[PDB]
Amino acid sequence: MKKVIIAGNGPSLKEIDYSRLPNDFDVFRCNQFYFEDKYYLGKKCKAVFYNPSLFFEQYYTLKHLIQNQEYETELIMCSNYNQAHLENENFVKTFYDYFPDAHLGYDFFKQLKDFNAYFKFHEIYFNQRITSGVYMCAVAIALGYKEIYLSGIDFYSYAFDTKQKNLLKLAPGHSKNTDIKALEFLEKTYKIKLYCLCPNSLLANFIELAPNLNSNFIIQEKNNYTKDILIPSSEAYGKFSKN
Template sequence: MQIRLKGGALKNAVLVAGNGPSLKKIDYARLPSEYDVFRSNQFYTEDKYYTGKKIKAIFHTVDFFFDEYFTSHEMVKNNEYQIENIVCKMYNFASRKEKIFQENFKFFFPSALNGYDNFFYKLKELSAKVDFDACYLGSRIEMLTGTYAIACAVACGYKEIYIAGMDFCDEIYSYADGRNIDECCLHHANYDIEILNFLRDVYNAKIFSVCPDSSINKYILLHDVQNPSKTLEIETKSQNSIKTRLMPNKNLRNRYKRIYLEANPFINLFYGFLRTPRALKHYLSSKFYR
């Protein structure tokens, strides 16, 4: 498979970290000596750098991508994180309604990646399953962004995938404020478990937990200790670090929103009526003075 991630060669392993309570209880001795890191949604709400500052890829949803893209660039500019790739969570069938977003993607997000076009499409069987569930079964349940990141890690060809903070079996999912940040779609833990099992069965994905206290261990094997002496010096984030989603100024946000208005046929019809008298006046004036 062709790898399209920026930032040099990929490691053999990747740590995909969600925002669940177990993120604070990673057993680093269960991780290999070298690995890349994937993060999702508002990972920057963490009070400490539990997976370090260097991130191979971050994943965000369409609904919040404009603000998250801006936030990510601000964090990089402030040297808070080293983010190599910004990925938008996209599908084939389910994202067809995001036509305007996709058509303008390269203009508003030139350094970002469309998750489907770059990674998810490689998982033909999984993509077909997701499309079938949405198209023919009418399913509105969507996998969590962290689960999507795991699928993309499989598409990238990582040999081992380690997960932390993926406690979607718990009633309280986010360590930040007791809710699952940025997951506005319907969600059911069983669906995420189904996707993880699908990745293991169809693609022979090796997925392991590195959090002894996580509820995910009921379904995912807790990896054995690999490096007994391995520790990670967890740096506390500064008081001035970004911990909430940033928003560009109002004028820039309105310019972004305008692409949706301009594509609306009713809005275009309305503007057409408003422009007609002026256009007619211009036409008659030009004709008269010819």
């Protein structure tokens, strides 16, 4: 169907070669994407992904971002795996009743049986965990996307200063090989096409560069924007304490 740009928040996010920006695409963002100092991929997101550990606060924050007209998103995804050691069980069980307009990412991730098996085996037995950038690719493939453009994936710093007060108060495997091997498995297994939008990223050594279309893109500035996660009230945490 339509193309999709999947963006991690690595430093390459600020080094996209926009001449290679595809025509007609959706955008997937994750975690502290809003910390970006400019709208490197626009204000419109098809989907935003948040880890279960901070979903409570990210959801709260997202609503503010939307009200402030800083961003808009069609879908709100929680990057879960249905694994007791990775996320809170009751959180997943009651998810749809606390966040009626959001989705459990596993609902889609699990549609890719071969990859789910691949991910689980390496995480359970070898402690290898893929990053959100790869999780988003899986969900995109599950949703039907055929051409995936990657950016902000640098296998580890960020494309912004993530050292924020509120975030620090909340959160004071991986490896390049795991992510790369996972991406190759996805591309091969589901016959989709991966492209790299960041020619200077280490990712460009493994994934084909997005074709040059002589495209152009206006990177809108951001001023007095939300650059830190918000913390809900004490009464709010009390009500959500069990999750």
